[model samples]
Each structure stands twice: as structure tokens, then as C-alpha cells.
Target chain A: PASILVVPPLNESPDVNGTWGMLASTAAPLSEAGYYVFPAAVVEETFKQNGMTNAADIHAVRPEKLHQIFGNDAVLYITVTEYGTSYQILDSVTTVSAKARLVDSRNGKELWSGSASIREGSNNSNSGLLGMLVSAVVNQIANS
Target chain B: PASILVVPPLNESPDVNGTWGMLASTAAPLSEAGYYVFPAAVVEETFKQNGMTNAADIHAVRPEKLHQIFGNDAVLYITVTEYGTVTTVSAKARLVDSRNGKELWSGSASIREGSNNSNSGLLGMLVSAVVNQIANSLT
Candidate 1:
């Protein structure tokens, strides 16, 4: 009876790859929860059509403007607060934090909102931490 | 290069039909995300075989225990927070390494919250969005 539209996440993390990883993390749980989440590729393509290639610019668009583009679907918006590895003397730490909200595209009505932060020890491999970061974000979405 | 074992979501919403609807929603996204997500029917049947009919009970089995049953694949555990009227699918999930029961990845997201549309098209759109999210994660 209800569905959702997910926009590309706004990346604030140092890792350039964090944006995509964080965006993908939201898919499975939401799908498993019974909402029709918009395809990411299509969204990105659409955003490009509008000349908004930057994730920040895409995210900066007002909710009403998005509603005009996307029609009446519910929209999920996310901002990545952190996503990367921090080096320490003995071990590194990979962490990710984000804030998100779901709003009605039709009238800009707020539907749901939440945030999550996670960290795990890293073995000096940024790539390895990225993989773990993806997994962690997935877990957060499933449990959020 | 790791395969994902998708478990049934722990439904907290009032609608019972939401369970199956939600379960069916996970397929395309993960499949398209370049991961081998376990088949839903097979997992459900397996759970039944283990004398576990409830999703909660099945999900309660330790990650290590599941590793033994489903092998060393990563586990995608999901919990649905809302699923009626304005369906709010806020999920908390974790990817666990079955070999040593280590948490490989963990994250949370609030996918959507919209009013009931009185039609299945709404659900269809939502599913499309999820698929997109999965695909978008790759780049």
C-alpha cells in the first residue's frame, strides 16, 4: 500500500567511495521491508539529466523540487556524516555515520527519520575497511 | 566475492501480509548488487525443517549456528520497523562472517515512509527504488 523513493546520499566522509557504499547499504532491508525503492542507476541518470552530477548539489535540491521530478512517491534522503578509515598507532578504525529522513513527495510531509553510527577495527587496509563498512551500513539499515 | 545469506525479516508491523511482501522485496536489489542472495523459499523451508516457523526464532539462532547450517557465507540479518499505512521500513542489518562469527559489516537505514496508496503500484515503485539503491551502491 506504501512505497519509497531513495535519493543518492550526500557524502561528507573523506573516502570518495563511501557515497556509493552507503547508498547501496539501504536497498536490501527496505526491499525486504515491502517498500518499492527506486533504482539507484535511474535516479543517478535522472539527476544527470537535470545537470546535477554532484551528490551535494543533488541533495541540495529542495523537497518540493524533487517531488516535481519524482511525482508522488515517498522519498528517502540520506547524508553520510563519516565513512572512512582513521589510522592509529597499533590499529586503524573504520567508521560510518549518517542521518536520514523519509518524506512524502506529494506534499513534503515527513514520514520517518533516523541515524546510525558504526565502527570496527581495521587491519591497515582501507579497501578491507570499505568492505566492512558496506556490511556495517547494511546491518544498520536492516535494523534501523 | 562473498555471497550473502538473506534471512527472513523480523516484522514489527501490524500487517501479517507484510511479511511475505517484504520477503519478496529483497531479491532484485541484492541480486543486482553483485551478490548471491540465498533464495527466500529455500531459507523458509530450511527454517521449517529446523522446527522454526517464526522468523524471530529463526533469526535468533546464533550467527555461528547459522554458519554451520548455511555454510560460511555472510549473513544479512534484517528487522522491519514499520509496515502499514505509511509503511516505514527502517532497517538494522549486519553482515557476519560465519567462519569465526565475526561482524564483517553493519549499518542502518530508514528506507521510506509514505501514506497508504490503496494500490500495489506504490509497492512496485518502492521495490524499484530498492533495486536502484542496490545498483547505486556498486559505483
Candidate 2:
């Protein structure tokens, strides 16, 4: 309700950075919608220290355990359906799509949910992976 | 260096959500760019609990205090230069060291109404694909 712990999203795409990149993109919009998002870097690092780096396993970590460590009101679980570069003859597109569910940490009950699809063309900068990826918030905001 | 504390933006516009909206928009880009963002809701709520709710006062809270309470690596100071309804939101953001008060990152952007971004989207691409198929026929 007040705080959110945004975990690394499960990647369904082949892009190696899909999970991390999508994970990286979430905090801003959720926060803007009025919730305190736990520090992502800190959250992941702690997860890594325990060798619980896989998104599925991390997602599987019970809500109670997350609550114990984070004391958050809710936890965000996202699955990246599409991410990375799709090139055409004259243009390159960076598209990121995902589904999310917010569950109450204390009770593991569903609070809210949604999905997003963002595709941006890069005529001049193909390397703006995360840069173009940043605009995903537009739809993410609208949906939230 | 790692974590960023986006203190509430100093709102120069009349729009009430300007500061909060701008504040909300920042974390994703910053995180995608590779930095940890302190939660805005928690940060502001903590400030309110201390009776330091005003934007200026929140901004004025010493860098040292930020470092101690939140252990933030840096602080972002944003002043919203323009506000909404057309809606032009212009602002300058400066990143300073949370403990030493040294400037780190500086840049600007302001989004106005209905114009959040024409730069990208799925709907835009659906048009591109269907249009691409017809372009060769016209040629």
C-alpha cells in the first residue's frame, strides 16, 4: 500500500539484459503513482549474496520472507515477455513488454495488476538500449 | 555513486502534482541508467514525519543528514521550471554528493500534457508495419 519491493522480473525473451533492464525500468512509475519502492540494487545484491539470483526462484521466495527483510506493504512481480532490438532495413526498434502483479506482502493477497508494451524506433542511435528503454514509463504510467 | 535520493522537486509551477509526478518519473530512467533510487514515497513521508514537509525545507535539510539517515550516495536537486496543460514541464536536475555536497550529474527535461512521448510505442509500430507493407506497392 505504501511501500513496494520491485523484484527482478522473469525474462521470457532471449536478450541477456531483458530481466535486468526491465527490472531497472520499473521503480520510477510505481513511485510516481505514490508508493515507496525499496532500493532495487540493495534488494538484488542481497538476493545474489544468497545465490538466489534466478528470477523465478526470487519470485518464488515467499511473501513472508520478503516482508521479513523488506517490511514492505506489497511486492511487485513482473515477467518480461519481450525485450531488445528488432532491426528493419532502415530503422531499429527497441521494444519492452511485461506483465505485473502487486501482491500484499503481509498476506500474499493480490492487490492490483497490469501489463505494458513499449516499442520505440531508433533511427540515429541503435545503442540507446536503456535510453530508449526509459520511455517505457509513458505507458507504464498510463496503466498504473 | 550508486544510490540516489530524489528529494521532492522544487515546484515552480502551480500544478500540485508537478513535483510528485516529476519525482515519480525519475527513478525508472535512473535505475535503467544503473543507479539505486531511494523510494520517493518513503523519503517524503519520512521528511513529513519530521515536520520538514515544505519543498524548500526538504531541500534544505543538510546533505550530511541525508547521508546518515538514508546512506544515499548522491542527491538529486530538481527545480521544476515550467508546469502543465499544453502542458510544458521544464526542469533542471543537479546531482550532488550526499555527504560532501559536490555536484555529480546535471541535465534537463520537461513533459507537458498529452505529449508524454511521440518518440516511441506499440501502436506506433503497428502503423509502421502495415504502412511498410503498402509503401512498396505505391512505389
Candidate 3:
């Protein structure tokens, strides 16, 4: 079976660029382990942050439009969180919280769901960097 | 037929516990609008830091467990951010970012998934605080 689709994390920092390279390193192991490792390039485009707005109108409307595009195969896995800024007291170790959901591509059926504690790092790093880390971890999860 | 499930933010602060309280505040308005709001209690039990592990072992152990509870729902949701110390900065918000289908209880055949970001704030208060201040001004 093809590897499950993965959405990349939104890059909120710059120091975290190693994730793509790291993901390549991490994914190869899973591939050798017999799981189908989808190319990161394809995965990247499939799951890049397309710049969502926070306005109530934008938030509600954008997601509705996203559903229409690849609604059949793409579930809208929404997540919100406070990526710690340098000035924040949380430092790199802690961060604010957020939530998420998965919508059925075909009929908007919600098939699965879950949550997490935000881990902090450099700004650019937290956004895109951690996403790759999480992806690698998730792939391992799927395998296990 | 449903507006989809919206999960409360996970508690990241050491002070008041995670962000479920804040996340609840986020859901309050939606609930008023008639959304099928999942209670904060449900979020805690299912998503406890330890109980709600990233591993799907629980579901693997009991296949029908989650489905029986949450199946047939229109959407699945969750929220996460780095752990925050209560003594200082408060960080919290809610959105659906990840999933393990078995963890969801909806009877629906598949999952509706997407990631959302909240307005930047000091303690997840940006949205509500701004709204409150604005409402007061209007009044």
C-alpha cells in the first residue's frame, strides 16, 4: 500500500531548515523497514502551509474552500498553537496550546482525531522544522 | 450534516493545567451557535498527557473502543503546543493537526482533517480579549 499522506508543519522559524534533510535521513530507515516512503518533495507540496488567515471570516471561509479542492483524499487536519517567540517566558522548551481535526474527503466524515503538547525551538525551526520531526515520528508510529 | 468536531487546546501551562480551559473558551461561542461541543471532561480523559499518547497502542489493543465512543461523527479534532510554565508566559490554542483513526469514535467511513493557527497572543487570550475589548467599546 502507498504510504499515508503527511502534512508538513508550518515554518515559524528559520533555524529549522535541517528537517527536510533530516526527514530524508529519517524516512529512508522506514523505507528500508518495508514501509512505502513517499518522496518528501511530493509530500512537501501536498502539505505545505498555504498561508491561512486568522480572521473569523477568513478562517471559516478558507477551510471551506480547502475542503472543495482535494476533499476526496485530503482531510483538513487543522491545528493551532502558540509558537514561542524569544521574548516569551516559555523559552524554547515550552509553548502555548492548540487544537485540530480531520474531515472525510468524500462526505466530510471525521474518521480519526488526537492532540499534542507544543514543543518549542527557534521560530523558523518550530514552524517547519518540528513538522518534519513529527512526520518522521508519525511514520515510525504507522509502522509500529 | 454536522459542523465537524473541534477539540480544545491541550494544557501546556504548569499553572492552571493545560489549555483545555482556554480551548473551552474557544468552543463556548461555537457551542452557543449550536455546534455539538465535546465537553472539556471528555478531552481530558481521552487526551491526558500520558493517556493520550502519540502511540496507537490503545486502539490496537481494542479496535472498537474509540469507534464505539466517537464513531459516525463529522470530524475529529485536537490541539497542541510546547509545554508552558505557568509562572510566566501562557501559550494555548486549539485546532486539529494529527490523527490515528482508531482514536476517533465517529461512525463515519473516513476522516476530515486540516490544520489551523490562532491569533498570536500572550496566553491564548488574543482572540477573546480582543473581542471583549471591542464589544465593550461598541457598547
Candidate 4:
């Protein structure tokens, strides 16, 4: 899937830092799961050169433009719904969830859509939160 | 640099999620830089098989032991200083030849994400930054 392009994820969560971190975290699973991910820096630099720096703006470009610019690769658009720590009376949890869609840039067809999330107690040092997130997201992508 | 054994990183940051993310992110760049990185899950399962689940315990195993197990491959010991942030990723990593327990290279990088790109993308670039450094030293 060298033709696969992962755009910067849309951030709906309160934490501004969550977007990039979440975005970076998502790539590994997809790549490991058997999709060829375009390098993040090259994609961003291409977008910036084309005056589409922000994800919001980048996501808005017509599919044809994306196809034209990024070749005939399928594009993965992800939205981060949550990414941070939440505290209860005596507990804290770090939760991350996001919706994703794979679209065929050539014809702008919706190939697949899925979502993944993970919430774990703050007490477990070995929670492997990133691992869980990667597994969840990879399962979704692989199944689709 | 023919092969590498990527042990779990020593995570000093508060976020538990960053370790695997950082580990996974390191693969592509190192591969692109031209080396075979042992699959992470396989490494984890191997550790679990040896009754050593903690990275610290695994890290404490002598390099000779690692060579005996993984077989003459290079090993990378990474310490994740920060993660889960867009602006920065601070990590210290070293590559050692497991066969004879000689240090190949060691360095640290404090990477600042350039844009509001995906964290994985930025982290990939950051890992690439450090991996490229190591690759340069090898070449």
C-alpha cells in the first residue's frame, strides 16, 4: 500500500497536542498491519507547498486534487475523538478514540470506515496503551 | 548493520502509551535506512517466554545473553524521555553489537514536530531523524 496516504488527523479532542501524537501513533500499526504509509513529512511538505497546511483545510480538498497530487493511492482520513487523561475520585484513565475512513482517491469512492478506542486505568504501568491503540486501529484497517 | 533487536524502551515520561508507539515508529525508518529490525511482538513474546516481562529486566540481561538468544545481531536500547505531544519527542538510543558486546553508536534526539501533522507522522520523522544519524555513522 505504498499508495496509501495518511493525512494528519482531525482533532476533536480538547488536547491540542493530541492530534500530532495520535497521528504519529497511528501510522506504525497500519504499516505493520501491511499497508504502505506515505512518509508524514513528505505529505505535510507537499501540502504546505500547495498551501494546504492545516488538516481541516487539507481534508477539504476535492478527492480529484488529492489523487492528482498524491498519485492514485488510497487515503486514510482519521479523526481523534479523545486523547488525554481523565480523573475520577481516585482513578485516572487515558483514553484515545478515533474514526477512520479509507477512500479511493482515483474515483473518490469510500472503501471502508471504522473506529477504535482504548481506555485503561492509570495504575497499570504496563498497560501498553500505544500497543492497544495500534492493535485496535490495525484490526479495523485489516478487517476493512 | 545487518539486523537489530529492538527491546522495549525505558520510558521515563508519564504517558504509558508512548513506548510502543515510539517502538513501532522506529521500524520503518531503520528499515529504510537499511537494516532488519526484529519484529517487536516476537521480541515481546520471547521476553515473556523467558519470564521477563519488564523492559528493565530484559535490559539488564547481558549483551552476551542477547547474542546467544537473538544471534549476533545488533541491539538497540532506547529510553523514551517524552511522548504523546506534538511539539517534542525526547529519546536517547544506542546501538550495540550483541555478538561481542561492543557499542556501535549512541545518541539522543529532542525532536520538535514541525506542524500539526499526525503524531505518528511526526514521530516517524523524529525516529527517522535519529535512525538516520545512526545509519550515517554506520555508513
Chain B structural similarity as TM-score, candidate 4: 0.76
Q: How far is candidate 3 from the true structure (C-alpha RMSD, Å)?
A: 20.3
lDDT tens digits, residue span A26-135, model 4: 45656765667767777788888987878888788777788888785788777767666667776565555555666788788876554444344443322222232233
- Predicted model with the maximum DockQ: 1
lDDT of 2 by residue, A1-144 (tens): 788888887878886655544454455555555667766788889888878888889889899898998788888787767666667886565555655567899999976654444443444322222232223223223332
What's model 2's lDDT at A2? Answer: 85
Identify the leading candidate in terms of lDDT.
Answer: 2
Sorted by lDDT, highest first, which candidate order results?
2, 4, 1, 3
Q: Each prediction's interface RMSD? A: 9.1, 12.8, 19.2, 14.6
Alpha-carbon runs more than 4 Å astray in model 2 = A124-144, B1-139
Better of 3 and 4 by lDDT: 4
lDDT by residue (tens digit), candidate 1, A12-78:
7676766664555556667766777667777778889988888778767777788788763777777
Give the per-residue lDDT of model 1 (tens digit) for B70-124. Answer: 7747777766554444434444556677667677655444433333222222233
Tens digits of per-residue lDDT, candidate 2, B50-76, equal 888788887888888889888999887
* Higher-ranked by DockQ: 1 or 2: 1
DockQ category of candidate 4: incorrect
Worst 10 residues of 2 chain B by lDDT: B130-139
TM-scores of all predicted structures: 0.47, 0.44, 0.26, 0.47
Candidates' C-alpha lDDT? 0.59, 0.61, 0.33, 0.60
